[PDB]
Amino acid sequence: LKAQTKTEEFDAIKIALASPDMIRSWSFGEVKKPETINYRTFKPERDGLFCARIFGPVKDYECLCGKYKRLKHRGVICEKCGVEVTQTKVRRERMGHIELASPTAHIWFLKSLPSRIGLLLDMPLRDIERVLYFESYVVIEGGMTNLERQQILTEEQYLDALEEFGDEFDAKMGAEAIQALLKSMDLEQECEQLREELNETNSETKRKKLTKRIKLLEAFVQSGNKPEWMILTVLPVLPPDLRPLVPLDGGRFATSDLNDLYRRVINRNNRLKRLLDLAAPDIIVRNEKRMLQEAVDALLDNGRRGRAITGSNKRPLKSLADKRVDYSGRSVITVGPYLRLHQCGLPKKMALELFKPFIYGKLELRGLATTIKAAKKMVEREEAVVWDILDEVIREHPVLLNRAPTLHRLGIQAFEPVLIEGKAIQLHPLVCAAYNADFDGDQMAVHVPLTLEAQLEARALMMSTNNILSPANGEPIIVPSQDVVLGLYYMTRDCVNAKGEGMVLTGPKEAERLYRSGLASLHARVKVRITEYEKDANGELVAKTSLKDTTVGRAILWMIVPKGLPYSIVNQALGKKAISKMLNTCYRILGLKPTVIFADQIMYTGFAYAARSGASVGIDDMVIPEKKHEIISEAEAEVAEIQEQFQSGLVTAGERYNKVIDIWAAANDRVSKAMMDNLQTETVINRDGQEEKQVSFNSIYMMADSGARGSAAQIRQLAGMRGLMAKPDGSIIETPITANFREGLNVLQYFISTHGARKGLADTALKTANSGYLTRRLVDVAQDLVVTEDDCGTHEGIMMTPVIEGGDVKEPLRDRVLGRVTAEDVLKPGTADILVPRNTLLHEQWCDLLEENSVDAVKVRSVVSCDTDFGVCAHCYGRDLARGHIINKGEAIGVIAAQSIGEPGTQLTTGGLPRVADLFEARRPKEPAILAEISGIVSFGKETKGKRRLVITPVDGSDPYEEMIPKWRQLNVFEGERVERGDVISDGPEAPHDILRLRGVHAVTRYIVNEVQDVYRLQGVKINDKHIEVIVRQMLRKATIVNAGSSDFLEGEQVEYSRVKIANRELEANGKVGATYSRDLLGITKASLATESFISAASFQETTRVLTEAAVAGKRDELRGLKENVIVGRLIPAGTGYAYHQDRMRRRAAG
């Protein structure tokens, strides 16, 4: 079958140098005149920057002169003025050209610091420019006389050399010279010489540059490009519609600067033609040629040179080198607690305007409207019927909600529209956590999933209810926020004595019936008969009932708790954490739907009982310690004691300072732990006896304790004194703020407080941008990484143990191993007993089985060790997702990894967020520790010059290794003792490169993850090891070859490519010629630099250099990646489109 010619669905893309004839191919005419339009009849002047003949008609299917105006005549070229009558859109398509009188250098290739003409000719830049401007001659193919080929001469020198040799010697100057140079160049011969010369002389300096240049040359050869094309003969002109002359109000016009530039080029070129036909002296024509060069250079890239300015406007004209979406909206948002988790309140008018085409279609579908026009007129009139029609089109049609600071994927979520009277969008409360959206006037945007696939994608993926879990960690993101948790807290709780204390009831029903009638208090100690279930039988619910000692409120609440959950979960005090673990266990037991509806009911009851609770905040609710003033007085005794000591000279200045600052710092804690006790347990009440005391029912304490809002620090700032603020200088004042907010703050205290507040504001405002930037670098380094294979089937993995830092368990084993697959079957303390067989996803039950037994460690497969090339296998990755099931095939994990790492990054403050940045960047620390290069006994050699050399002595092996260690740095290593490779030869931080090379891949992959997780966990942030492990996988992506037999020696190359080539070379080919390598750690920003697709690289990297460097190589972008396919505007090679791209990829490179 004949392949094809006319437009199909294309694959890949190719970029290369353009031939003069190739350029003329695109051009449908030459633009010979600087003129644009006629100035009266605004029609385009023929063959000019704007032309109907060359480019296209000014109006659809209408000839310029107006001869053929009919839609019938089409392929007709008019006789008066040749214009094919066709849509005006082809004036946005057809290109043009200009034939340059003299050759002109292409500025991108001339100066883009790989000066391409230069390093292709092995000729320095200044010589090339000195030639181009006629400031000197350059030899070309000098033959056998006196002179080198690339050698440059001057006026006198050239004259003399010419007088000596008339022929068999050649020299030119200007652009023509460079062109002749390039054209004359034979790549083959140069190659043949370079190889021999490479082989003969042995020096690093020589053969390094030699091999680099021969590689460059052969690359350029295989490219298909020819050197001449770097020098411009024909100059293409951009379609007129892309540089519009379009009019405006008041008769005035507006136009692109490209018209000014192109006009300059045309004029100078024409003047050059004339000056050639007029036989001007050289001094003139040379100047005209230089001016033409300037004009062309300014037209292409005006960045360089002197930056020519547009007419009458100082601003430099924008050169050639120099998204809004329909069906959408936005507005202020409100609560709507009545909503189910799966829906959101959508304003009537908004929904009307959004679904307008759907409304038209349905309206004339049922026959309510004669035609679409009539439909428009109807909804424009807003006739009463159309509303009901809207209710039809809204029902199963989801909408997308999005907020401004989008970080993690939950930043956009799909809901089901519920028509609302008002202009505000009602957003479900439980989702307010995911969006990070307060109600203080934040706005949200709506989108409409038009195509069927978009609706189903919205419902099965982007839906609210389908994501109940944070992608960062398995913990529920639907956890009730504030009002609700204060509701369940006030509900589930007990005081010492109340109505119905001690009585007994048949069940929750008459418990609630007792409460609602005012007979029994919401919180009272009561025994009630409850029936709790358990699914502990195989796939089956077991029922049991008993007398539980609980409170009326907990009994009432139990009515909501579904099925197999134990009563024990609602028998606590029900704080925010317990109320979260409730939902979590509910999810890992009953499944999704029960968890959803449970969550809803939890919110409703929360708001309800919080409303009934009558919880408020008064000024007397904040209790200042009675002993505060006394503590103040005592510490204030200390300060003058130390003052009197400084006056007697017993203590120094700095010592006095530290002492006073310490005594105040202690005073703060004293007052804090006074007010805390007083605000906590001080309620003293009586049941049938004298007294007894319990946790206070004081309002603000309830809020802070429940987890609704407020915290011990802030409560500390309300009641007790607040801190000891500090100037911007960083120095901390030894006279702290003794007054609190409840008390009045005098002028000073507040003044000094202002700073702290502002620096807080400024710093937060800055860390926003920092977090964002980090997320950007992170998604750039990952991106295209997506689950591709299913199971790579490697036994390889990392050893998981609890962190055990300092004292007991800074992080458990169960957490680290949860949701992860086992590398190999682990054992009980006794063996021939396989509890967890081979590779099995470790879920809740499994981890609990591991917890039953005493197991201290589990080997776990990771994304960093996965044998799959160009991606990750689902088996190795893990489970975690919005769903508890194992990761799907084709889900893009790099994006979510980066998002999950960067989203909490706002909450981060050596240490802090910049520490995370330095970590991912692989940067060597300021004053690092040096590890032992090789095991064996060591000794200190030589003496003091700049360094004192350390000589290693391996037992069996040789001792070529001697490392020169600067001696002014205090050492660690014992000069009389042996040290293993990767031991401490000094203290201080260690470069991850060293950890990788000397210790191991798993060693360094553990170092990074543990360090960054130290940074996050110190701030109380949950991020699964997974994401960081994928970022690490991306960091170590490259490697440097050591041995040979296939590829070049020092080449940095993909571990994927390499491993693929050696595993392929271990068999077939040479028996094994396979080459060794060395894994290499690359900082995220550096690893992001490496991308196969040039369209991808042209985005985030520097555009010019990328396009040029790719163009000279004739690089062919096969797409295959996310970014490039986004740019080109086709389905992402992941997720839903993964099937497509899969299928297609297989159809390609095949029969």
Partner 1 sequence: PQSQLKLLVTRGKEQGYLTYAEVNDHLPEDIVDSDQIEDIIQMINDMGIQVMNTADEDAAEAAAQVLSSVESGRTTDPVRMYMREMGTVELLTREGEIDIAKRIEDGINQVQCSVAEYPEAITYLLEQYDRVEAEEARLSDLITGFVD
Partner 2 sequence: ARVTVQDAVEKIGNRFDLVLVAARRARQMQVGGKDPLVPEENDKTTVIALREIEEGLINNQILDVRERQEQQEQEAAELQAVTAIAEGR
Partner 3 sequence: HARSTGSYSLVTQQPLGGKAQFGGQRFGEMEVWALEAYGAAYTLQEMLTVKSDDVNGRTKMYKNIVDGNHQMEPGMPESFNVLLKEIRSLGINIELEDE
Binding-site residues from annotation for Mg(2+): 438, 440, 442
Residue 679: its H or E element: helix 653-680
Residue from 144, 278, 283, 452 in contact with partner 2 (CB under 8 A): 452
**In the window 915-974, what residues touch partner 1 (CB under 8 A)?**
921, 923
Strand pairing of 525-537 and 425-426? unpaired
Using the rule CB under 8 A, is 287 a contact of partner 1? yes
**How far apart are alpha carbons 150 and 135 in whole angstroms?**
16
Residue from 424, 866, 908, 1036 in contact with Zn ion (CB under 5 A): 866
Site size toward Mg ion, by CB under 5 A: 1
Residue from 1139, 1143, 1147, 1148 in contact with partner 2 (CB under 8 A): 1139
Q: Could you say which DSSP state residue 1120 is in?
A: -
**In the window 760-799, what residues touch Zn ion (CB under 5 A)?**
792
Counting Cα atoms < 13 Å in the Cβ hemisphere of 486 gives: 21
Least distance from partner 2 to the Cβ atom of residue 365, Å: 12
Residue with smaller CB distance to partner 1, 218 or 921: 921
Binding partner of residue 438 among partner 1, Zn ion, Mg ion, none, CB cut-off 5 to 8 Å per kind: Mg ion
Least distance from partner 1 to the Cβ atom of residue 115, Å: 8
Residue from 197, 626, 851, 1102 in contact with partner 1 (CB under 8 A): 1102
With both helix axes pointing from N to C terminus, report the angle between 653-680 and 628-647 in degrees, rounded to the nearest 10.
Answer: 170
Residue with smaller CB distance to Mg ion, 438 or 956: 438
Least distance from Mg ion to the Cβ atom of residue 771, Å: 16
Residue with smaller CB distance to partner 3, 217 or 898: 898
Residue from 14, 305, 373, 727 in contact with partner 1 (CB under 8 A): 305
Residue with smaller CB distance to Zn ion, 67 or 513: 67
Please give the torsion angle defined by the CA atoms of residues 643, 644, 650 and 655, in that order, rounded to the nearest 10 degrees.
Answer: -10
Residue from 63, 120, 185, 631 in contact with Zn ion (CB under 5 A): 63
Q: Could you count the other beta carbons within 10 Å of the beta carbon of residue 365?
A: 13
Residue with smaller CB distance to Mg ion, 8 or 438: 438
Using the rule CB under 5 A, is 65 a contact of Zn ion? yes
Residue with smaller CB distance to partner 2, 211 or 1136: 1136
**How far apart are alpha carbons 1013 and 1019 in whole angstroms?**
10
Residue with smaller CB distance to partner 3, 515 or 1094: 1094
Least distance from Zn ion to the Cβ atom of residue 790, Å: 9
Residue from 16, 726, 1089, 1131 in contact with partner 1 (CB under 8 A): 1089
**Residues in the chain followed by a break, C to N above 2.5 angstroms:** 322, 909
Residue 236: its H or E element: strand 231-237
**In the window 548-607, what residues touch partner 2 (CB under 8 A)?**
591-593, 596
The residue behind tokens 């037999």 is 1045
Q: Per-residue x/- mask for Mg ion, residues 427 to 466, rule CB under 5 A?
A: -----------x----------------------------
Binding partner of residue 593 among partner 2, Zn ion, partner 3, none, CB cut-off 5 to 8 Å per kind: partner 2
Residue with smaller CB distance to Mg ion, 21 or 438: 438
Residue with smaller CB distance to partner 2, 684 or 1139: 1139
Residue with smaller CB distance to partner 3, 482 or 1108: 1108
Binding partner of residue 577 among Zn ion, partner 2, partner 1, none, CB cut-off 5 to 8 Å per kind: none
Q: Per-residue x/- mask for partner 2, residues 325 to 344, rule CB under 8 A?
A: ---------------x-x--
Q: Is the dihedral of CA 986, 989, 995, 997 positive or negative?
A: negative
Using the rule CB under 8 A, is 322 a contact of partner 1? no
With both helix axes pointing from N to C terminus, report the angle between 893-902 and 747-781 in degrees, rounded to the nearest 10.
Answer: 170
Contacts of 1136 (CB under 8 A, 6+ apart): 453, 457
Contacts of 925 (CB under 8 A, 6+ apart): 988, 989, 990, 991
Tell me if 574 sits within 8 A of 488, measured CB to CB.
Answer: yes
Please state, in angstroms and as integers, the Cα–Cα distance from residue 483 to each residue in 80, 576, 606, following that order: 80, 11, 7
Tell me if 667 sits within 8 A of 659, measured CB to CB.
Answer: no
**How far apart are alpha carbons 702 and 490 in whole angstroms?**
8
**How far apart are alpha carbons 509 and 1124 in whole angstroms?**
61
DSSP string, 443-499: EEEEE---SHHHHHHHHHTSBTTT--B-SSSSSBS----SHHHHHHHHHS---SS-T
Using the rule CB under 8 A, is 254 a contact of partner 2? no
Residue from 313, 764, 768, 888 in contact with partner 2 (CB under 8 A): 888
Residue from 112, 465, 521, 1005 in contact with partner 2 (CB under 8 A): 465
The residue behind tokens 């317990």 is 578
- The closest of 148, 155, 164 to 134, measured between CA atoms, is 155
Using the rule CB under 8 A, is 290 a contact of partner 1? yes
Q: Could you say which DSSP state residue 317 is in?
A: P
Phi-psi region of 644 (alpha: psi -120 to 50; beta: other; left: phi over 0): alpha
Residue with smaller CB distance to partner 2, 702 or 876: 876
**In the window 195-224, what residues touch partner 1 (CB under 8 A)?**
212
Least distance from partner 2 to the Cβ atom of residue 892, Å: 11
Binding partner of residue 1041 among Mg ion, Zn ion, partner 3, none, CB cut-off 5 to 8 Å per kind: none
Binding site feature residues for Zn(2+) = 63, 65, 78, 81, 792, 866, 873, 876
Q: Hey, which residues does 171 pair with through a beta bridge?
A: 139
**How far apart are alpha carbons 91 and 1104 in whole angstroms?**
27
**How far apart are alpha carbons 570 and 550 in whole angstroms?**
9
Residue 545: its H or E element: strand 540-551
Q: Hey, which residues does 1078 pair with through a beta bridge?
A: 1040
**How far apart are alpha carbons 708 and 710 in whole angstroms?**
7
Least distance from partner 2 to the Cβ atom of residue 474, Å: 16
Residue from 402, 853, 1136, 1142 in contact with partner 2 (CB under 8 A): 1136
Residue from 330, 376, 581, 889 in contact with partner 2 (CB under 8 A): 889
**How far apart are alpha carbons 66 and 331 in whole angstroms?**
50
Residue with smaller CB distance to partner 2, 466 or 680: 466
Please state, in angstroms and as integers, the Cα–Cα distance from residue 645 to each residue in 631, 648, 733, 798, following that order: 21, 5, 19, 59
Binding partner of residue 883 among partner 1, partner 3, partner 2, none, CB cut-off 5 to 8 Å per kind: partner 2
Binding partner of residue 232 among partner 3, Mg ion, partner 1, none, CB cut-off 5 to 8 Å per kind: partner 3
Binding site feature residues = 63, 65, 78, 81, 438, 440, 442, 792, 866, 873, 876
Which of 9-17, 124-132, 846-854, 895-903 is the region at the interface with partner 1 (rule: CB under 8 A)?
A: 124-132
- The closest of 620, 621, 581 to 478, measured between CA atoms, is 581
Residues at the site binding partner 1, with contacts judged by CB under 8 A: 111-114, 124-126, 129-130, 133-135, 212, 283, 286-287, 290-291, 293-294, 303-307, 921, 923, 1083, 1085-1086, 1089, 1102
Residues at the site binding partner 2, with contacts judged by CB under 8 A: 340, 342, 395-397, 416, 452-453, 455-457, 459-461, 463, 465-466, 591-593, 596, 883, 885, 888-891, 1135-1136, 1138-1139
Residues at the site binding Mg ion, with contacts judged by CB under 5 A: 438
Residues at the site binding Zn ion, with contacts judged by CB under 5 A: 63, 65, 67, 78, 80-81, 792, 866, 873, 876
